[PDB]
Design a protein around this motif. Structure first.
Motif, PDB file in Angstrom:
ATOM      1  N   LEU A  11     -38.112  91.526  71.788  1.00 18.72           N
ATOM      2  CA  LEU A  11     -38.988  91.097  70.698  1.00 18.72           C
ATOM      3  C   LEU A  11     -40.238  90.412  71.245  1.00 18.72           C
ATOM      4  O   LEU A  11     -41.352  90.696  70.799  1.00 18.72           O
ATOM      5  N   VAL A  14     -42.569  93.049  72.911  1.00 26.09           N
ATOM      6  CA  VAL A  14     -43.371  93.843  71.957  1.00 26.09           C
ATOM      7  C   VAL A  14     -44.438  93.046  71.182  1.00 26.09           C
ATOM      8  O   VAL A  14     -45.510  93.586  70.882  1.00 26.09           O
ATOM      9  N   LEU A 125     -35.042  80.554  61.138  1.00 24.32           N
ATOM     10  CA  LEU A 125     -35.476  81.009  62.471  1.00 24.32           C
ATOM     11  C   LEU A 125     -36.309  80.005  63.296  1.00 24.32           C
ATOM     12  O   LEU A 125     -36.019  79.787  64.472  1.00 24.32           O
ATOM     13  N   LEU A 128     -33.996  77.186  64.555  1.00 21.04           N
ATOM     14  CA  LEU A 128     -33.031  77.635  65.575  1.00 21.04           C
ATOM     15  C   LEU A 128     -33.630  77.743  66.950  1.00 21.04           C
ATOM     16  O   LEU A 128     -32.982  77.366  67.931  1.00 21.04           O
TER      17      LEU A 128
ATOM     18  N   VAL B 123     -29.132  85.166  60.839  1.00 23.88           N
ATOM     19  CA  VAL B 123     -30.624  85.214  60.781  1.00 23.88           C
ATOM     20  C   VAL B 123     -31.325  85.540  62.101  1.00 23.88           C
ATOM     21  O   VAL B 123     -32.265  86.349  62.145  1.00 23.88           O
ATOM     22  N   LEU B 124     -30.934  84.862  63.166  1.00 22.79           N
ATOM     23  CA  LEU B 124     -31.509  85.161  64.469  1.00 22.79           C
ATOM     24  C   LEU B 124     -31.319  86.661  64.737  1.00 22.79           C
ATOM     25  O   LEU B 124     -32.292  87.363  65.031  1.00 22.79           O
ATOM     26  N   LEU B 127     -33.330  88.983  62.161  1.00 20.58           N
ATOM     27  CA  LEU B 127     -34.792  88.888  62.339  1.00 20.58           C
ATOM     28  C   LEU B 127     -35.322  89.501  63.621  1.00 20.58           C
ATOM     29  O   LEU B 127     -36.460  89.959  63.642  1.00 20.58           O
ATOM     30  N   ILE B 128     -34.536  89.497  64.694  1.00 25.23           N
ATOM     31  CA  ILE B 128     -34.963  90.222  65.886  1.00 25.23           C
ATOM     32  C   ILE B 128     -35.214  91.658  65.434  1.00 25.23           C
ATOM     33  O   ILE B 128     -36.300  92.202  65.658  1.00 25.23           O
ATOM     34  N   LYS B 130     -35.633  93.149  62.302  1.00 23.20           N
ATOM     35  CA  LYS B 130     -36.738  93.364  61.363  1.00 23.20           C
ATOM     36  C   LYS B 130     -38.105  93.211  62.018  1.00 23.20           C
ATOM     37  O   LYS B 130     -38.954  94.103  61.882  1.00 23.20           O
ATOM     38  N   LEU B 131     -38.320  92.104  62.730  1.00 27.78           N
ATOM     39  CA  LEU B 131     -39.624  91.857  63.370  1.00 27.78           C
ATOM     40  C   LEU B 131     -39.976  92.880  64.440  1.00 27.78           C
ATOM     41  O   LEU B 131     -41.113  93.353  64.479  1.00 27.78           O
ATOM     42  N   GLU B 132     -39.022  93.227  65.306  1.00 29.42           N
ATOM     43  CA  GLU B 132     -39.302  94.252  66.308  1.00 29.42           C
ATOM     44  C   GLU B 132     -39.696  95.552  65.619  1.00 29.42           C
ATOM     45  O   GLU B 132     -40.708  96.165  65.971  1.00 29.42           O
ATOM     46  N   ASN B 134     -40.928  96.005  62.635  1.00 27.39           N
ATOM     47  CA  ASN B 134     -42.245  95.820  62.008  1.00 27.39           C
ATOM     48  C   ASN B 134     -43.404  95.792  63.013  1.00 27.39           C
ATOM     49  O   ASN B 134     -44.511  96.223  62.710  1.00 27.39           O
ATOM     50  N   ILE B 135     -43.141  95.281  64.211  1.00 23.12           N
ATOM     51  CA  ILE B 135     -44.142  95.269  65.274  1.00 23.12           C
ATOM     52  C   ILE B 135     -44.319  96.694  65.798  1.00 23.12           C
ATOM     53  O   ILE B 135     -45.434  97.119  66.073  1.00 23.12           O
TER      54      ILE B 135
END
Lengths: 142, 139
Positions: A11, A14, A125, A128, B123-124, B127-128, B130-132, B134-135
């Motif tokens: 992540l 990217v 997030l 955390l 969540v962690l 979200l990794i 979803k965000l990846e 989306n990027i």
DNA sequence: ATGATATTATTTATATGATAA
DNA sequence: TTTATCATATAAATAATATCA
């Protein structure tokens, strides 16, 4: 099996890559835009050790990057009046429009990325990230 | 907000804790990540894709492969079906080495996630993804 | 027209070699 | 001092069209 830590590294890879792409016109390396990004946000009285950690390279590596940035005329490294082994790292007048480009991509890019997730996600997030960092540094002390 | 900078700091301190716990092994960070990923993934997976798992480009993977092959930890037998494609897998002598690396990575992940709640981990993880993704949409 | 191949360009897989980070 | 990286090189499989005794 979870490969969560590795997934998190990806992540960040990217995210950085997207910023690096958008900044393609400046023709700066990633260490260069990341270094300038952090110099702007951090006080000049702060030491190279503290600057190097925020950026993510070692102290000697930072010295090499700062050499390059000074040749380009983007920073100055002048001895402080209160301590003579400490040097203030300051962006030069002529860097101002470049810093604007780097800051804007970084900020816009974050807003776009975080624009795709709930407040709950963002908040849970964000908290955390701080907690896990907190734990690891403690474990590193152990 | 400095969420990108924050994530990047977390990533680096986490890796540095693994690196520290593996020190007596005297593997460079690049070697132990590569060994880990070579063991994780099917041998049929490409060199470009292995580099993707690792986080490096393919020319950097090639010299890393030569070094690991030097040490007799991996082989690169040329595919009999496709004479330009190769087969990257661990040797038997790397068996106790990967056991060390994998051991430290699993134990450290499991330890790091202690103290934090179930819906927080969910969540962690979510979200990794979803965000990846989306990027990946952007760019 | 037939098979046997040959000629050229495209894409996919991996490797090297000067330097620059 | 390694170490990794950029722009390339081999090289094999892919594929389209072409040529002849």
């Amino acid at each position: 099996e979870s490969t969560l830590g590795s997934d998190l590294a990806r992540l960040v890879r990217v995210w950085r890559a997207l910023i690096d792409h958008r900044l393609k016109p400046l023709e700066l390396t990633q260490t260069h835009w990341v270094t300038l990004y952090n110099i702007n946000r951090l006080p000049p009285e702060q030491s190279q050790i503290q600057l190097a950690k925020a950026i993510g390279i070692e102290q000697p590596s930072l010295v090499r990057t700062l050499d390059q940035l000074e040749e380009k005329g983007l920073i100055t490294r002048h001895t402080s009046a209160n301590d003579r082994r400490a040097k203030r790292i300051k962006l030069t007048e002529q860097s101002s429009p470049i810093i604007e480009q780097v800051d804007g991509v970084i900020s816009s890019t974050r807003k776009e990325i975080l624009g795709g997730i709930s407040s709950d996600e963002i908040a849970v997030l964000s908290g955390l990230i701080d907690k896990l960092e907190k734990n690891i540094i403690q474990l590193q002390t152990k």
